[PDB]
Design a protein around this ligand. Structure first.
Ligand SMILES: Nc1nc2ncccc2[nH]1
Length: 158
């Protein structure tokens, strides 16, 4: 049958040559995991404007440019709506990260990426992001821990 409907999300990784900024989600879905900054795209909002807005809301940072690096679709058993996540990266930041209601920020060295406390899917696509390779992925989850199926491919255009 038809693919489920999807809600549009952004995810921003602040990735510098030696380190990445991650936020620990303090409450709600995925609480206790480190990850990038993002959220739902709003009505009438361009995807990149939503990415910038969510980065500022969750981390306090504003940035010059955002680069498209991949797309990941998430599906959860028992929920018919998919998450269509557009992933971006930025290197040049202005300002200092601030703890928000949603996120507590810490920098991680790129030989200390905290996979054990990140979403399981990150082990598959985060290495591609570090290699500056664009990707499309899909992950079906049972709950927050178990992957039942996934696809992943390198692309030349997000
Ligand atoms: N990396 C990553 N973030 C996520 N957020 C919500 C659901 C699944 C997720 N995987």
């Amino acid at each position: 049958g038809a693919m489920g409907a999807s809600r549009l999300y952004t995810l921003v990784l602040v990735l510098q040559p030696q380190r990445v900024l991650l936020g620990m989600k303090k409450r709600g879905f995925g609480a206790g995991r480190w990850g990038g900054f993002g959220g739902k795209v709003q009505e009438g909002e361009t995807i990149e404007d939503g990415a910038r807005r969510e980065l500022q809301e969750e981390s306090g940072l504003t940035v010059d440019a955002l680069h498209k690096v991949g797309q990941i679709v998430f599906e959860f058993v028992g929920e018919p709506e998919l998450m269509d996540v557009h992933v971006f990266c930025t290197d040049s930041i202005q300002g200092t990260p601030v703890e928000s209601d949603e996120m507590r920020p810490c920098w991680f060295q790129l030989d200390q990426i905290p996979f054990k406390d990140m979403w399981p899917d990150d082990s598959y696509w985060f290495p591609l992001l570090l290699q500056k390779k664009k990707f499309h992925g899909y992950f079906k989850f049972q709950g927050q821990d178990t992957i039942l199926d996934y696809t992943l491919r390198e692309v030349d255009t997000v």
